[PDB]
Design a protein around this ligand. Structure first.
Ligand SMILES: Cc1cn([C@H]2CCCN(Cc3ccc(C(=O)O)c(Oc4cccc(Cl)c4)c3F)C2)c(=O)[nH]c1=O
Ligand SMILES: Cc1cn([C@H]2CCCN(Cc3ccc(C(=O)O)c(Oc4cccc(Cl)c4)c3F)C2)c(=O)[nH]c1=O
Lengths: 196, 198
């Protein structure tokens, strides 16, 4: 079994990459695509709070993302891994570190301590980082304001810091290239890991 | 201002004590009494998830108690402390430490790290611990309102003892084995000595 997470800001081609890689992996592996809360009842209710929430305190929001993460991990991810599945998970711990920790200003290590409580040692076996420049990412967003532009840059800066410190499970894919190549590089990286 | 929390297992008479003590304190201090979620909408919606939980994972439950704690602290406690009020809170971080950490088995230090993210340095100035023996506690439950319930009750008490041993300075342990009139009086007097020394 394998627990593979996908990380990157918006405009990184993440949705296209997961769907295309899923279609290629299904030939050889029992594979699933998922994202938090991913249909888990408690997680869905938490997501309703987050999405109905107005001016929510950033720490409360971080704790809700971590609570939906745990529900999705315990009721979806772990049973799938137990079945021998390759789990392709859209966003996990690193999204909270880059968005809540870095971009929102809580502190990466403070958001890490929170998410280590939530995942309780269950780190991904492999994490694909779709390394897009802010400029290409910004262009893909308009295809698919000032505060939004700067928040997007801060998210990327956050991801740079996370990938700088930890580089074992992390595999950076050049997401500035056309999506066909981003898909191919992501596919080859996954196969190399799975076949090892 | 002062942030005073109230802790204890069920059967310690905690609700009864806090109500009576608050009623006496209102006569001399600008004081509010609250508990989580305490009407804060997001906290109330979180409370509904906790209660609707079917064999909920203990870590998710702990994070929901901590998110409810943040909302209640941010919207009710901190603004009252900024207005110079005395804030009496029925259950706070130590309830998570004792129930989720010790009795549920997540570990006190792990639940403490979660709750330190939630409270962001805002520990109580004083914590009243209603120190009821497991035997008096057991009997009081049967009068106010099995083997598994008794064991969890003993574990909650053992947990609070562990927390108090490691952080004695913040706590004031009140004999909760004595009649409720006496528990109220000792709790009220402990709070007065603290309030008149600030
Ligand atoms: C997983 C995750 C995502 N995000 C971001 C990722 C980029 C998009 N934003 C906004 C957004 C967009 C859509 C939804 C949406 O799902 O409609 C959404 O709600 C949730 C997404 C995941 C979990 C939860 Cl509890 C809510 C959301 F916050 C969330 C974080 O800030 N932190 C995390 O840990
Ligand atoms: C504050 C707190 C309380 N408890 C216990 C205290 C003893 C009673 N139980 C059960 C209980 C009883 C009533 C309610 C109730 O409020 O009806 C309740 O729901 C909540 C109480 C506080 C916060 C939240 Cl999110 C839910 C509850 F869990 C919870 C914990 O285990 N951890 C904590 O952090």
């Amino acid at each position: 079994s394998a627990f593979i997470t996908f990380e990157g800001p918006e405009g990184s081609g993440k949705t296209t990459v997961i769907n295309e890689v899923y279609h290629r992996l299904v030939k050889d592996y029992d594979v699933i695509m998922t994202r938090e809360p991913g249909g888990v009842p408690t997680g869905e209710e938490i997501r309703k709070i987050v999405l109905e929430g107005n001016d929510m305190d950033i720490r409360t929001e971080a704790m809700l993302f971590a609570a939906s993460r745990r529900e999705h991990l315990v009721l979806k991810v772990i049973p799938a891994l137990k079945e021998g599945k390759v789990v392709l998970c859209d966003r996990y711990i690193d999204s909270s570190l880059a968005y809540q920790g870095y971009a929102r200003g809580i502190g990466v290590e403070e958001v890490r301590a929170l998410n280590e409580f939530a995942i309780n040692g269950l780190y991904p076996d492999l994490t694909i980082y779709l390394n897009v420049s802010a400029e290409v990412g910004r262009e893909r967003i308009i295809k698919n304001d000032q505060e939004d532009l700067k928040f997007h840059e801060k998210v990327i800066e956050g991801y740079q810091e996370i990938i700088h410190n930890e580089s074992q499970r992390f595999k950076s894919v050049n997401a500035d290239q056309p999506l066909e190549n981003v898909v191919e590089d992501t596919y080859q990286t996954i196969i190399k890991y799975l076949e090892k």
